[model samples]
Target chain A: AQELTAMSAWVNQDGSTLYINSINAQGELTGSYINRAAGAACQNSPYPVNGWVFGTAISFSTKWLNSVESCNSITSWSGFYINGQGKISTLWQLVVNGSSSPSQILKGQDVFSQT
Target chain B: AQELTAMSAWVNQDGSTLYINSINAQGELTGSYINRAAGAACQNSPYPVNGWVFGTAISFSTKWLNSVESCNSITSWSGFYINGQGKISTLWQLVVNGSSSPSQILKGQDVFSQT
Candidate 1:
């Protein structure tokens, strides 16, 4: 995969599962996440292609953050950078009623890989 | 990706999202599925490698079926076969309390492709 190739457990800290997929013909890699902990349909099933970044040396996702409040509801446009090394640093922007700036939601560098 | 080369959609019939991942170091491809509809941690984060069947002509998974009953608990092992013609045929073995025979958990062919 030409990545850093080594990482930790694929589980996330806040219980959400993250992914790093292979590049597609659409220019960047994408996702299709489902929220198992919610009774409602909270998923990012093949998120918008523009939210992905399938680089040669790094993988990134600038997609909207979602909540269990509703189905297919995007909370914020979160950004992440997965280095060639075995680490993925995810970020969530602040949303004070509509939009906001960058903030630290996750407190650590999550070691995540994909299927 | 040449199977049928063209399909309808990627969603499943039961509303649960299915996948057909890429082959890993171990024979067939694998998965890291999470149950978003559950209120607890119910995940198949990289299910046992043996349950996965990666092939040149097809892709498959024969892993345990899990319900959102308890945390990290297993129910039954389901088997699925995805042909090179853009079709995935899945089967489920019945389990009354523990063991049973084949039943149609998913009554149709799910057009599931992986990331």
Candidate 2:
């Protein structure tokens, strides 16, 4: 059932937490993102957290879109997987208004576990 | 079961075909790579197709890897997935002997489907 590939919970180094809700096989990993700073800024953010989404795999790695979105300000998505040695890795992406496609603005490794 | 994130088959414009075995929940994508040029060069390739792997999801996208292996000359792996709207995307990585971690050598978008 590949459901809940997220390993129960996830926290990003950027001081963010990804609360995933049923990551579809189609790779449509939907979830709520509450960033320490970003969501806090939402109070004054010109943007709204409309259509928030995230993606991951059953292997339960730490965390792509084609390469991702946010709200009025941005729409974002990330792709994650575990390696042969059980190490988590990720490729994050972001797309702003009027942007053609997602860009490889960030990526990270380690800082994850699966027990 | 999200067994095959990969579609029935796939072909790269770079003139390569990936024959995937199975992508496990733990993210161990297994497969064979046949390149008209490269596999043909295996005779001349100091690298063996050791530890070959490929990954994909159930919606049948094109194909991650943990921000990803291959042979004596090079060990490589690519991570693939369909976007929110059924667009195939990928983040490729490669590493060689005496390397610490895999590096993002390539990325691609679109050129995928779901049926």
Candidate 3:
């Protein structure tokens, strides 16, 4: 629920982390992401993240530029940051390697929190 | 309530308009803004607009770079697109001349629709 601010280390249930570096006056975000999922193609690699935030609503994305690996995809996570609970509830969409078909798009949800 | 797609022209009640040129695979937006409000310092000027969208939630911004005019501000609009109605309901925050004081920031709301 980190309601008022979003610049922090947000950890998902499985330990994937989003390190928010800054949120500018225009609500633009600059940050990085680390995937910790088991068997994840880009697991443990840091990818550049960009997003926007307004009030308690936030959305961000990271593109996997790992040409050396089998992962070339883009993901966007969007949701609300709950105030008192200091959590971000989000649903994410993943498009693999520029795929345009809806059937190929992957989706998931995550609740992020910071201690 | 343009729930599914966001690439279109959105008009506010005051005639202010946001022309969304495109929404990329990452939900990043490329567009332009035209201010039509009375007494607006940058009225009629087409400023570059950038923003992001996620599902029904969306946000966008335009920075006024007019050194020739009294307007040098950045405004961000964020909210949701109500499905079936094809309207965007948003609250906006404007930061003028890089001012960091909260009291100097102007706030407003606009409901945008496409015909």
Candidate 4:
């Protein structure tokens, strides 16, 4: 029997998605998606990988969004993308609509690859 | 805190299954299952890796089955299988019968590995 794996996911009030990408022991991009959606995708895709799946609706606070608070300030948004290797990559709220063309709101890439 | 991930799954009318198989970061057979049923399984699997979870019920149209169609015609179905790395391999539309020894109406395979 193989070891069981799980993941989690979270959706924003605006309908944005957040996900995680896992690499092998050596580190590799196996797949990506907002948690909970991945395992199901794997099962449906041509292939399936071990992992976790969970998610929640994204909630925003007016006070926090309007405040100049450093940590609470609205800085970035989250989403996913696929690398050349076909591995799924996860992008976080480093910026707003970073996925939009010609935008710098996106800034993060930690690749997980196996040896 | 850990990272986030996600995946997806879809079913047919007759109620068939689908899935994928993933390799480690080595050679190992982790586990196997149908999707939508996986993460929920994983959440239930005991270990939480980074991944996705989701699924749907099957649908059918007797009219289409009774008519003459090309690709639209019914044939092999979709499902899943697992490999050594505990990876999940997706299987599609194998076969179905309210009875016994149904023909093999299913097949498919693909792998995702990062370096």
Candidate 5:
């Protein structure tokens, strides 16, 4: 199998989606993210994204800002592209609100395939 | 030891810094970040941050944008506040550039203490 070199469409098991818009020669990436589990106000809304790819390993983030529908959160994902299986495996960390204790800082995992 | 309820100044062993600006009633946080290890171009500049705290667990992020000095990256820190020791222990992920192969998506640990 050849190394995956470009970003495209990918989806998580939770039905969240990533639409990669551009990837520069330097490996910087920009995209739109839709996290289905973020809540009704947040789900399906496109959020700005910033990320990078280093070989098969990829990492990116989105900050919930400037939108009322935002959950006031920031999330980052880092992981690898399984070239042979055509999948992207990732683990994510999410922080929301401010100093108040919620359900604890959240973390989870996802595996994506071209969608 | 009491739980941390406010944002303040914290520093990492690598000299990276976080200056928390605000924490709302809902547990949302905003701050500034300086990663000295991010190189001279990035070292001393304050980047905007978004985050949250859930009890002893804390998570936050800074997106490197709107500044030429920025290395075009995003960094997120997730970990805990050690109340008894008055320290914050964190693990961080940084993504730089876009789609280019750099140094294999960086990850590291930083233990921060009140400063």
Candidate 6:
């Protein structure tokens, strides 16, 4: 059985996808992608697709986005995925011009099958 | 081992007994006896008996009736029972004087023995 993974990402009410590439399993993101998304606006990005209950083991990551309006941007984000049934382990978010560290927005487990 | 079975129903507050003999495991009402005890004023038929936790495999059904005043009358009602050790795995809701289609207000699985 594969182990569960969880990560986070912050998206603005808009539709911008903040992709972070530096952060590793140790939560240490150090690359060009990190700096770029960190300054992008999150508005018009993607709505928080939370509570996605799955049952498979999956990988997770976090990213940031800066748009023209800093307030509407997603400053940071983090999430994690589980193995076996692609379930969500945990999710975090940080709004632009708001908080620096992503806060845990949702956390719940999922069952593969029920009889 | 027998597979778990879930069901639904509606009830009145009065004390009128609802006898429904049409629906089955798939939530489908069949026969004609699927009627409520007319004028049976259910002002005290029965309070919403909910959050009943069970374990084993059990059965369930529903019916309706009236105490003269359809207001407090349990226009419709339904419920289920397990065998192992009855345990409420989820939650749901429905009021009186409504349609006949018993909604699966609360849907979930029951674990017989949890460590």
Could you give the DockQ of candidate 6?
A: 0.01
The DockQ scores of all candidates, in the order shown, are: 0.01, 0.05, 0.06, 0.03, 0.13, 0.01
Off by over 4 Å in 3: A1-6, A66-70, A98-100, B1-115
| Candidates ranked by lDDT | 3, 5, 2, 1, 6, 4
Q: Which ten residues in a row have the lowest lDDT in candidate 3 chain B?
A: B95-104
RMSD (Cα, Å) for all candidates, in order, is 20.5, 12.5, 9.9, 20.6, 7.5, 21.6
Q: Where does candidate 5 stray beyond 4 Å?
A: A1-10, A14-90, A93-115, B1-3, B38-41, B66-68, B100-103
Taken over the whole model, the C-alpha lDDT of each candidate is 0.29, 0.32, 0.67, 0.21, 0.66, 0.24
Candidate 4 residue runs with Cα over 4 Å from true position = A1-18, A25-32, A35-115, B1-115
lDDT of 5 by residue, B1-115 (tens): 4245555788788888888788776556668888786444577778777666555556776666545474655666876777554677766776554423324556677888887
> Residue-wise lDDT of candidate 4 within A1-115, one digit each (tens)?
1111123232333232333335334121232222223322212111222222112111010101211221211111111222223222222222221122213222332222111
Of candidates 3 and 1, the better by DockQ: 3
lDDT of 3 by residue, A2-97 (tens): 543546888888789988888887666778888897767788878767766655556666766543443556666655566455676666656554
Compose the digit string of candidate 6's lDDT tens values, residues B20-105: 23434322232111223355333344322111111221122122222332232211111222223332121112223212222312
- Give all TM-scores, in the order shown: 0.27, 0.33, 0.52, 0.16, 0.57, 0.20
Q: Best DockQ goes to which candidate?
A: 5
Task: List native contact recovery per candidate, as a fraction of 1.
Answer: 0.00, 0.00, 0.00, 0.03, 0.07, 0.00
4 versus 5: better TM-score goes to? 5
Off by over 4 Å in 6: A1-18, A24-27, A30-41, A44-67, A72-78, A84-89, A93-115, B1-115
Cα lDDT of model 1 by residue, B1-115, tens digit = 3331112223333434344444444322333333333342434333221122323122222222333233211212122324434343332211121211122112122334432
Where model 2 places Cα greater than 4 Å from the true spot, the runs are A1-7, A24-28, A37-78, A83-88, A100-115, B1-106, B109-115
> Could you tell which candidate, 2 or 4, scores higher by lDDT?
2
Interface RMSD, in order shown: 21.3, 12.6, 10.6, 19.0, 6.8, 20.3
Q: Which of candidates 2 and 6 reaches a greater TM-score?
A: 2
The pairs that clash in candidate 3 are A1-A82, A1-A86, A1-A87, A2-A86, B1-B82, B1-B85, B1-B86, B1-B87, B2-B86
lDDT of each residue in B33-67, candidate 4, tens digit only: 22223322111111111222221111011101111
lDDT of 5 at A53: 57
Q: In what order do the candidates fall by TM-score, top score first?
A: 5, 3, 2, 1, 6, 4
| C-alpha lDDT of residue B27 in model 4 | 21
